Every structure is written in structure tokens, then in C-alpha cells.
Amino acid sequence: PPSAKGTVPFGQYRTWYRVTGDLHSGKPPVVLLHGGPGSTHDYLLAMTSLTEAGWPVVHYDQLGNGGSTHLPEKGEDFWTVQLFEDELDNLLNQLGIAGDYVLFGQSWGGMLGSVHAARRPAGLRGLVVANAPASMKIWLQEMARLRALLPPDVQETLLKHEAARTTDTEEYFHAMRAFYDRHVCRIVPWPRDFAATFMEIYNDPTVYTTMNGPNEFHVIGTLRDWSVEDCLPDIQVPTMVLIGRHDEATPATVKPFLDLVPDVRYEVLENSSHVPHLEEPERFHEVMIDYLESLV
């Protein structure tokens, strides 16, 4: 239930946002970076709970999907990490919060958040990288590991359709679901917020399919080889790594955060996978509030 919403100009285009709570009360805003790339803020809407403890919360849709400008006819060389860094900087400026803010980055958003934090901006108080790998290379190795633990028939079904690029078929989708049900979202039927974002991706898949791939594990888009490991030593703020025990973002994928970020803490939500804010709503809230209070 938002205290403000709309768009801000981002050069030629628009970026859509929403604030819950009061921006300039006693506590700095928590700015939420959604995953994908090419996902939407919707699946993160549970995190309005943080306003219960006085934290303003800023949800926004990154350029290319949701309430922001859609650019279906922009291709691979337009959809860059620099673009989204520039958008986040622009957004903090337009909302007048560049002077004081905390970043929570989920999935891709945690990778974007790390790149942003590595430039050592003055107003940043803390960084959370939630369900976010440090490297898509390590991600793809770990996907192969997790996929090898699926039933043999599921493994063959995934392979067949990936090879021939028929991943839009019904049969691939239900094999993909055997993976998602373990490591992406263990709640089925899906939470509305999760479904909401999932359908935003279906309706304009430009960004997600360009940068990531057809789904969470089949990463064949332009971020396939991408790693943020080289900027991690430069992050000065206290950082929290938060994953689910069953997360596709496995302990191996987040290990570089633990070894390279100077000030870093580690939390595993034992009954969660990729969306602990939905899977363990209360425990996620408690963990976040505990971390956030150390910053004020």
C-alpha cells in the first residue's frame, strides 16, 4: 500500500517506481533491485513489511519491463549493465535519496547492487545481496550439478528441448517446474506476487531473454560469462549475503562474496530457496530488520 508512485525521466525514457512509508522520516530508504534482468518489482512486494519497523521501501521496475519504458526493438548491444547502473543512479537522484540509502539486490539485482557499491558512492550505508551469485560461470556449473540431481527423465526432457530450442513447449515447462519447485519457489500454487512478475516476463521477454535466457538455469543470454568478482574487494559498506538452503544461488555461487567483500555477513534461510521473503516471510523480515538496525 504505497505512499507515492509514478515515473521519473531517465534521459529519453521513463523509470517506474513506488515508495512505501515516509522517505524522510527517521530512517534511510531501502532501495530494492529486482532480478532477471527483465523481471519486475512485483514478486518483491512482501518487503513492504519492513515499513512496519520504520524503514521506507522503494520498489522500482528497471528499464525494459513493467511500468518503465518498453523497448521491444532494442537488441543485445543496448541492454547492458552500464544502462541499468545509470538508471539506478538516475533514480536515486530523481527521488532525492542519493545522499542516504541502503541497497537490497535480489538475484541479478544483487549483482547490479555489487557493481554500484564497488564505485563507493557516498550515500550508500549497506548492501544486501540476496539469492544472488557472484559469477554466472559458477552459476552455470552449479546448475549442471543441481540438474544432475533431478529425475533421469526430467534431465533428458530438459536437454532435448534446450538443444532444439523448443523450450516454449508444454513438456519443457513441466520439466523446468521440477527444478523451480526445488530451487526457485517451493510454494505451489505460486504466490500471486511471484506469478505477477512471471507473467510480466512472458508479456515482454525482451530484456530477460536477451540478457539471461529463457529461464533461471538455462542462461544463454549476454550475461552468460559475466562475473562481478573483480569489483567485490572495493565494497566498503557492511554487506549481507542472504540465500535459501535450497537456493539455486548455492553456497558455491555466493562464496566469492564471503572471500572478497571485506565486511560481510552470511545468512541461510533453512526452509527457503530463491524467494525467502515469500517462503519464510517472518524469518526473512527478522533477518533483514536485524541487519538494517546495525546501520542506524
Question: Resolution in angstroms, to 1 decimal, for this deposition?
Answer: 2.0
Name the phi and psi angles at 207, rounded to 5: -70, -55
Of the residues 107, 114, 135, 272, which is catalytic? 107
- Tell me: cis bond preceding 191? Omega within 30 of 0 counts: no
Based on the residue annotation, tell me whether 153 is a catalytic residue of this protein.
Answer: no
Based on the residue annotation, tell me whether 274 is a catalytic residue of this protein.
Answer: yes
Of the residues 68, 135, 247, 285, which is catalytic? 247
Name the phi and psi angles at 2, rounded to 5: -80, 140
DSSP per-residue string spanning 200-256: HHHH--HHHHHHT-SSSS---STTTT-B-GGGGGG--S-EEEEEETT-SS-HHHHHH
User: What experiment produced this structure?
Assistant: X-ray
Of the residues 41, 218, 246, 274, which is catalytic? 274
Q: What are the structural domains, with CATH classification, of the chain?
A: 1-296 (3.40.50.1820)
User: How far apart (Å, rounded) are the C-alpha atoms in residues 292 and 27?
Assistant: 10
Based on the residue annotation, tell me whether 107 is a catalytic residue of this protein.
Answer: yes
Burial class of residue 173 in the structure, from the number of CB atoms within 10 Å of its CB (0-12 exposed, 13-18 middle, 19+ buried):
middle
User: How far apart (Å, rounded) are the C-alpha atoms in residues 288 and 296?
Assistant: 13
